[PDB]
Symmetry: C5
Subunit: 364 residues, 5 copies
């Protein structure tokens, strides 16, 4: 029923919404996130990052950690209405910390500018914009509404000005997965305000199927560089898994077309069908190369696509070697196997689908 | 059992509970006062200056220094009641405690976290609640008006913030409300009223009604971890160290409140073990693990057992906490080889001397 | 025939341009250079040097690392038209990083000035000027054309003002290899613009064949110091190998004359003809003394001169002990034997010749 | 000599009669003076390498300089041929004592930017005694204006206070720090024919109330005038230092308490050969607290003329510290306390604080 | 002549270099260490870069001595081999440039003595700088530093004229005979270049240092003099005496010839059946090379200055073999240098032509 190192069944994770209750291990993760003074990640809105120092999070990855926690908390709010207020509180803290210079300051240290939202920098500010929207869908609070409208207009105006569809992270550095976050943030703003910023999405989905995708492999190239026209000629599994998951919330048929191809290209089923692991690129047998996140993002994609078999296989690969334990009702891993480990396992366990988040029942 | 001395214990529970009646501290309490006061530069109460070598040597985290100073101060106030011959020394140490508490090393996390340059103007009640209680206890012990103008100013900030808030009490930064931090601030208003004949303590009844209605699970006798008034969230876990601290301070203001919940608190959290000889405290529900979270459930429950007059539980807890830390006396000064938690020597000192918060509130004026 | 411990045969490297495809290990090197967020050397145009921190590159060597990667990327553009846009993008990043104060700021820290291009400093600004030109040959982009024109004129004007042929790196410190880069940059500017800045080259080639070369040994002296007149009395293999490789792009006959003499002076064939290693100076049997780059620059010169036998012998010496491996389609060395290791083995495996780069067809 | 003793007690006590320091005292002066840059008395500049090498804590440097200075003043009385050297070293001691490395804890702790304006009597009492001893040894008026200014600050602060003496900070009064300040007034009066010392009788009357246990011959650790507190532990090092300096001003005072002090704190052991000093009551442990009870008792035994206890204490202190003489300079491999070489030097030479007050004028 | 165990070349070979007009191969390998490798060789650049000294762990306060002793050796290379004179001049230009950098003189300001290291006092620094200016111009004929040389020579002349004792202090109350020896020799060199008579002050100084500063029977100087107190530190010093007698031999040969045999009896220990020698730093000890640890190395320079081939051989047999020299790629390294300034002082003693020969160097 449960192999060593698994805490709950795949059936149990997929049934949380129908039961209106998170699993006990998800509650223990929420306790890790919230319980201990000063050192839990969601203790305070202040510019303190002790939880991330303790996990040895690299500075450039903090912005991804906060965002992926926020996306998981939005699904907790949909699963269990009794945890919606807590999830809203944690989302307020997530937005507050995301705005701290420890999180965005690499933009200035690299020489690109003193203001991280004014131009470009869509990985940072796409996540921030999606977070502002999810906070307001969950709580009904207008605390960040003026900032949200301002950043949504920046994103709209940059897309409208560019001859390619979307926005760069820096001059000649375009990433499809960073764009996927920014476009989903426009769908959320439209849900809140009755606007049509999402009308830009069709041009983007047409553009990314042109030279940014390998159609036979169902896989995006690593990056695009508009000034040279270059596409870096390696396909990327973690890039593809993230992008197809977010796109499925905006154009389900797009992701349904490429998902089986993606699986054939990258996913290695092993141990008699019990486990799976994901190769990061073509022309290798090695799993989880590059940034080391192909299997963890494919676990999120399997959840988004409703693929219980692949979800179970990947969590059987990822969770047992990391040695979970529950101490004083809080979850810890002795041997996290990647960056963003507890963040991505939490998000995949609770994820209700990006379309379900867009359609979240309005706040009491 | 209260007159037995287990291995790793320095004085009996009977001896600690008899100190006020005998008008003398135990020898190990005196040896703790020697640790606190004796060696130049490195003892914690050597000087009023902004020097923290004693805390560097113990590896105290910056955010915990304010609690270390405050818990030492609360124990020093009880030393003043136990032995009139030590009351002047306790007053001198309280002056140093207040002076160090005002140093930016102690409060400066407020500014580093981005909340402001002034740690008392608004919010921040754990820091400024302890500072306000310290100002009051210093003046009750000494009769000195050295800090009276600052005490009046901070008492009025606290009074005005309570009056302005729609919930009863003050936050620790927007949407972060802690019952234990508020308990300190309310007790500080009782002390100001004792010194000045005022009625700032009239706010207390609305606060006790609010925390009993909304923030306690009355059947378990246990408070929830925290309240977040903007979102309305209550973090849905009960906390033993939060509850032990809050019930101990509340017992000084409304004894009946803490007497109602104390037996239920013990059933919820306290594990008696070793054939009744020892006890250890679980931090939350749904676990068998002792002293999770911040690791202070047993140490705060030792203070609560002293406040409630529960000699049996005090003995059990001290039998769990003290022997593994390996106390000894060297050159008439107390040392521990293996302190078991943050705030270890501070909380064991406080629990060994504690006269009760009601007795501190009523401290008779000093001899001329 | 694949020699032990090698990734590809010498025949395979020399056939890349005819096959219009890089070898799989060259592609794996391009993956190392480009793939991983933040830590790959060609991730961003920003002033971030994590890739160089992870390799323990000394500050003073970063400028050479960037330039030698750039020179290899220009040959990738000629080998495979389908990788020309990638090579162009990487060259844009290389120019951007080369202008960062982390790269040039030793000039100011040493006390020489706040502006690294206005005078002297030809190793830095010679490489930057060659990189501006190669970027524009590969891409057709005029992004850096005004900066290129400005720096080409500074180089022209300094050559015209000096009584010796060329430019110093600081007062009394003249290096033939740094001048070779600067002169090659004038040939590239002339290819792009139809100018005649290269007309200064003949006076320079005449000058360096006086007190700066031992013509019998085919070897340059370490350095010249025009204020004292001093020539440092040691011959240098890495100085000679670099200089003869770049000179072969401007005056092939010069390098054809000295190359066999250079090999007799410095090159030790060993292991029954299978391997070779290069002595850095005369009067020693030790290989790869000094900066430790004689064998690696001789690998580049063997490629420039079309010498497949010596190329094979040197790569059999250099590559196996460094323990290459390919993980997730990206190349790593466990034990690089020198500074600039992956840069110089990359450049020598792809190098099409400096004259072929000069004559690169438009995009 | 028993292992780790360098000279007999008879030899130390006979130095003034022989007009010569012992060879180990000369080897200590060589440690103090010989090696460029790293000897403590090499230069008058604000360099503290000797103290960095001994790991002296910042707050202890002011005591180290002062105790060296007090030993140098006795060297000047022992051997007229070393009086000029002792004066030169005293000039450097005063110069270094004024450096912010030495006094700057006053500002870092938040008490003020001026270390002499008010309070801070441990620092400025030692500085004022040093100014006086420098002028007694040399006849130089180099520091006379500064000496007059600081003497007047001390006189005016004593006159303003309702308790007898001066605090180190508000509510922190130390009898041993006051003993230094009062002795500095006796030295100023010897030099100038003034009567600043008239304050001494009120101070000796005051410290024999709540600050001393007369039956034990022991001072309490500290007094806190704002609260009235006297810390309730007696202190051996505090008592030994205070009785030694007081014996120079009121010999009868120290003679009254010295036998009681010895009964309270001194343990003779090893068949009468050794002695060691407990720091407080209610312990069998020697040298607790700051770890200086035995070393200050060695100074007190010298001041009181107690050759037996001096020998017993030096037999305890010196051998385990493993002295040796290398190139005519004294080193200790295992100093047992802070201020170790300073206090053993001072006790070996000390002529008595009254003898320093009566020092004949220079030749 | 037989090569003693562990030596690179015979004493006969070092003493024959000037007559043969060629340096020995190990001296050439030392010049290669000094000049060959980019960035890390000490004489690579005129810039304020000290990597060579960082690699040897040279203390900051000793850098000024390292540069000066290299410079004095280079001046003798110029006399030994006309073909190396231009190289020696180039290296001397770099030596002067580096000597002027704040890393070299800045202890003067850090210790609190002033912002200008030449205006007054500080004769060890500025005496060496002044001698280096002169030797640079004798070797090259270059007037690059002539204005600075004239300025510093006048400062030294004016300070000697103002003082009631003969010479200049390092700091107030600290007078060192060896530091003064350098400053006086610098006046002889300025006079050789300019036909002036700044050297006229030398006789008063030689008279002065033969009073309380010398033990005439032992042929040994006291460690230091302190004019404000009148103190003379009561220990005689071998390294002080060896350096002073070497430089004085270039100005008053008879002075050093008088005291040299006495100095040897006082301090020099011959051992190993006459094969080796080592030098005691002070009286009243059997220990060799106490204090700063340079008595044997400075006595090797003095043996060379005085033409004493037997003592030179004995001292080099003591100093060089245990330091484990080797030649790698034609460049000299020591595995175990025995003291500060080790490769500098062995280089200088191996080439030294005599301070009188340097003073009278024939033109380029």
């Amino acid at each position: 029923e449960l192999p060593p190192g698994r805490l709950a069944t795949t059936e149990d994770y997929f049934a949380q919404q129908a039961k209106q209750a998170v699993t006990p291990d998800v509650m223990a993760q929420l306790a890790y996130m919230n319980y201990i003074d000063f050192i839990s990640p969601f203790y305070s809105r202040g510019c303190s990052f002790e939880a991330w120092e303790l996990k040895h999070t690299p500075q450039r990855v903090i912005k991804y950690s906060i965002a992926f926690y926020a996306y998981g908390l939005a699904s907790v709010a949909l699963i269990d209405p009794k945890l919606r207020a807590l999830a809203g509180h944690d989302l307020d803290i997530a937005v507050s910390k995301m705005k701290c210079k420890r999180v965005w300051g690499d933009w200035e240290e690299d020489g690109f500018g003193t203001d991280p939202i004014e131009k470009e920098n869509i990985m940072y500010k796409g996540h921030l914009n999606l977070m502002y929207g999810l906070y307001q869908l969950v709580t009904g609070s207008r605390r960040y509404e003026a900032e949200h409208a301002h950043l949504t207009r920046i994103i709209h105006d940059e897309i409208a000005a560019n001859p390619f569809a979307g926005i760069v992270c820096e001059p000649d550095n375009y990433f499809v997965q960073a764009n996927s976050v920014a476009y989903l943030s426009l769908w959320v703003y439209d849900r809140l305000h009755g606007t049509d910023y999402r009308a830009a999405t069709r041009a983007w989905l047409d553009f990314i199927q042109k030279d940014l995708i390998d159609p036979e492999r169902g896989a995006f190239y690593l990056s695009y560089h508009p000034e040279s026209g270059a596409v870096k000629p390696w396909i990327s599994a973690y890039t593809t898994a993230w992008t197809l998951a977010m796109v499925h919330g905006m154009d389900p048929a797009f992701s349904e077309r490429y998902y089986p191809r993606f699986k054939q290209t990258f996913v290695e089923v092993y141990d008699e069908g019990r486990k799976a692991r994901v190769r990061e690129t073509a022309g290798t047998d090695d799993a989880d190369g590059g940034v080391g996140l192909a299997s963890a993002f494919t676990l999120l994609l399997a959840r988004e696509m409703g693929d219980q078999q692949l979800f179970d296989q990947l969590l059987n690969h990822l969770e047992p070697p990391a040695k979970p334990s529950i101490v004083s009702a809080s979850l810890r891993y002795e041997h996290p196997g990647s960056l963003l480990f507890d963040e991505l396992l939490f998000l995949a366990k609770v994820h209700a689908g990006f379309g379900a988040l867009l359609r979240m029942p309005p706040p009491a």
